[model samples]
Target: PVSEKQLAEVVANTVTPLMKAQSVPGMAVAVIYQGKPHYYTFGKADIAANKPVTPQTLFELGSISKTFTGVLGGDAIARGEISLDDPVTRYWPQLTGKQWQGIRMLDLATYTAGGLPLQVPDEVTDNASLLRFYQNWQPQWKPGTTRLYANASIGLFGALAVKPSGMPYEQAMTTRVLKPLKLDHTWINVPKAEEAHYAWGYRDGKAVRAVRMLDAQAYGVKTNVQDMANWVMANMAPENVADASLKQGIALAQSRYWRIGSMYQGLGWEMLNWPVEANTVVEGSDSKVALAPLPVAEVNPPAPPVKASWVHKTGSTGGFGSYVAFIPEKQIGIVMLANTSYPNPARVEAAYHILEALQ
Candidate 1:
């Protein structure tokens, strides 16, 4: 095993040049070894003010927040509160009608509920308007025919998961997900108490304040590397958690449920194999042909007795970037957060090298 001090030096050598090349203002990266976490950081969280980014510095998670919702949805299903095949209208009576009758929970959860847009419409300014938009929207293709990454599909799925609990979604999330895992620094909204640790993102050298959205479940989580390391470790080894539902939630979230090409969509994560070409692991899911159905020859499943060792996802806002990858077989995971939008090849390239060294 590499000593923590040696690991730190190795991480610094690996990350420093990447930051310089990407022009990233700052970053926090975490690597988990045998369930213990080691962290490394570089640059400044707020450059003009010259603040260093720390493991506990909060950055907006953007779409990686979908993974949290995916786990919560899986937990809801495990608890018998819902089912993957249930119609969305079943839980959300407001969306009941012929338009939504053909859409199942799995369709939305997997981004197969056809024709949902990539972002919330400008008219959807409030709760009432958002529901109205859902009630009136129509699918351009039959549900489950294609896979398009639509924020609306997962956003409403999140609402449906928490509706039956008779409590606000945040409160339900706290009790069901965060508290059980003891993730103190993760948040849907940055609590007043942690205000000092919140980090602002940057774009073109200007600081951009994080945007808090109404669809909190879809892309609203703000968290730090310290908390995410524990979260990733738990997903890789759910049995470590004592709560039955929590254990089941982690399992279901990571389990394979949809497939195309060499990619399998498990809840919000994209699953592949160890040593996969970095492009396929990082960009295969959202490729132009991602929504199209392909022949059997073009797709392959993880071979028996050696299931996938690669599960990952990426996220970005205008001013922040995030990526997470874990190999359950090796009990190793990597989390990277940056104060710039979509530090691509760099995020996966750096993580891939780190995982190789740890192995």
Candidate 2:
């Protein structure tokens, strides 16, 4: 096991260069090794206020929030309220008789819903408009045949996942996922009391707050390093989760359902066979892959959860950047949160270096 001093050295050495090179204003990093966590913070959470980043500083998680949505969906599945095979029409009868009828909940959760756009159109500013957009939607390919990473697909999946709970999306996520995982510091809507700790994200050297989106479930979570580290730890060891349904959900979210090149698509996290190369991580996270459509091969019967794997997810808002990766068999993981929208490759490289050093 790496000592605290050694872990700090590794984190500082790897993160410092990446922060400097990318001009990131603030960052908080957490490492979990041998079932324990160590935290490190760098630069400023608010440059004007001269506030340094802290373990409690709430950084926008962007698409990483999708992972929570995935867990919520899995929880609903575990409770017998939903199934992966359920068509979109199961919960959203409005989408029936439209092109979206053929799309399954699994297709949406896995981002393989026949090439949905990367985002909801700008014209979709409210649920009414969003519903109309979906009502008139068209599929670019056959359902489940291709993967196009999109918030629109997962956003709808999340909204529908909560239908059986008789609550709104945010509340369902909080009660079903966040509460079960004990992620007290994570929120889709930061309340007034905790608002003080929410960090300002930086964009092009200017500080900015997150913009409200109709698809809030897609890119709308703010969480601190401590809470995020706990989330990562739970992923590696679901038996520690007290809620039986949530434990089942965590296992379901981690299972692999589809393969896109070197990456295996789980509910939210992407996976690679263990002992993965850094270049593979970079390629899997690259924008070229994320922003384009790619063929997908179904993993028939779905591969059950395994410890020997590299699981990861990258997230970015207009202002913030985030990355998380964990190795279950080794009981090691990393969480990187930054105020600026730094490149995905830099995050992956830094995390890969830190993980390598820990070994």
Candidate 3:
């Protein structure tokens, strides 16, 4: 196992250069080891004011928020409200139309509900419209035909949990998961007072204030590394959580029920192995890496043209960019937050480089 210092050094080395090369104003990287989080920072949290980034600085979690939904759904299962194999139409009979009749709950979890494009349909533009959209939209492909990450799919999954769990999605999340783990400062909605922690993202290389229009259950989670580390710790140090429910929440977060390639997608978190490469025959330099539900989802089980070997995801909406990953075997996981658009390319490269170095 890599020592804590070694892990910290790798992250420090990884983040510093990117801050310089990408010209990112500031960023935060958090690594959870054996249930403890060590956060590293680079550049100013705010470029104009020259404020230093810290574990407390808030960053938008574009897609990493999906994990919350995934866990919420899985927790529903743990509570005897739902099962992984349950059909979507069962709970929300509204989705029982011809196209969505047999799509399993797992399909929504894996983003394999036919070839429905990444986002949900148009009607699901916001929280209120989501139910109507799910009921009205039809599947594009046969069940499990392909994997297309959808923010709406997971968002719906989370919304459904609120009812079965007998708590609002936000409250269930706080008590069932976040509060138990002591990971405060992490939530879907940015509180009115702490809005300053959020970063302004660069679009076309120009910085613009982040948009907070949607605080939907699925996306737009505002948090910092201090709280994110608490999340990582919950997953890493099983004993950190004494509550049976809390421990199960963490377990579901890391379990890989849907196999993408070498790695598998858990309910929300991920599973990874050494020599983790993308789902392709032409592998990289035997680098091992895995990601939590960032913006992307798991591989399409129906079409394994290239199986996803590593489980990874990124969140990039508005000005906030964030990513989280894990390699279960090596007991390794990474959490990253960037203040700018921080294109997916940067994260892919960053994850690959770490895997290479570890290999």
Candidate 4:
């Protein structure tokens, strides 16, 4: 293994020029070497404000916030308070008559629940009414039926996740998840003292996309590279050391506990299948090796025996676009958090290259 100092230097060298070349306003990256953490920053936190991008500058974490929720669930399970198989109605008793209450937490995590849509309808204003919509929103298929990714579904589970932790779902996250991970800047409710540091997000057309500014659990959470680095470190480590509760929390996020075709979904992570020829790598299991790159690109031909198996998640609101991907085989993880929804194919290519170099 590379020495921790060497790894830190490697991270700094690896990220610094990329930030400069891309003209990114700020870049904060953290790499974990043998369970020790190293964090790095480049550019100004706010180019308009002319503030330095400290390792401490807070930004909206985007969907990475779900990982925190995963940690909270894991902590609850480890405490012998809840099980992954817990039904939605166990904690949210009011959900009893709703269509979704019949769905399991596992279904919510895996995105396999039949009818949960990406977003609940706008007219459902109150929490009570919202819960009723999910409860009564009849499933199109049976539980564990078909794959459909829905943030609103996972977001709704936010309330139930706290039941076992004995705190409001939000507070439970702080007590059981954030505190143990030593993440000081990650918060479901961003406090006023740190209000000035939260980066505003924008799009190509100059519209503000401040999701965290909304301050609601549906994609709510403010973080900085410092806290994010700790998060990446925790994921890099095979096991969590804080306690059994912490261990389960990490596992919950990473565990391929649900079946989603060649695509695997756990609590907060997506395991993507690689495009590769079948003749390659006579291995232990077919799933261990990836089959191909994502089919999103039409011109890209079906290529070699190589597979790019990666567990990742992407989040976006008006201004912020974030992604975190970890490849277990190469022991490499890449994070990209941007204030604007600009294209960054090079960032993805850079991550692939880093894994190649490590291999």
Top TM-score: which candidate number?
A: 2
State candidate 2's TM-score.
Answer: 0.97
lDDT of 3 by residue, 14-112 (tens): 888877777677788876565456778877677766677887888877777777766666566767788767777676765546777778877777766
What lDDT would candidate 1 get against the real structure?
Answer: 0.77
lDDT of 2 at 194: 90
- Candidate 1 residues lying further than 4 Å off, grouped into runs, are 1-6, 283-307
Give the distance in Å from residue 117's predicted Cα in candidate 4 to where it truly belongs.
Answer: 0.9
TM-score of 1: 0.91
- Report the lDDT tens digits of candidate 4 across residue range 103-171: 777666556667577666777777777766766677777766565656666776665666665677667
When 2 and 3 are scored with lDDT, the better candidate is 2
Query: Candidate 4 at 75: error in angstroms?
Result: 1.6
Clashes of 3: 13
lDDT of 3 at 328: 45
lDDT of 3: 0.64
Winning model by lDDT: 2
RMSD of each: 3.1, 1.2, 5.4, 7.5
Decreasing lDDT order of the candidates: 2, 1, 3, 4
| Cα shift from native, residue 258, model 4 (Å) | 2.6
Better of 2 and 3 by TM-score: 2
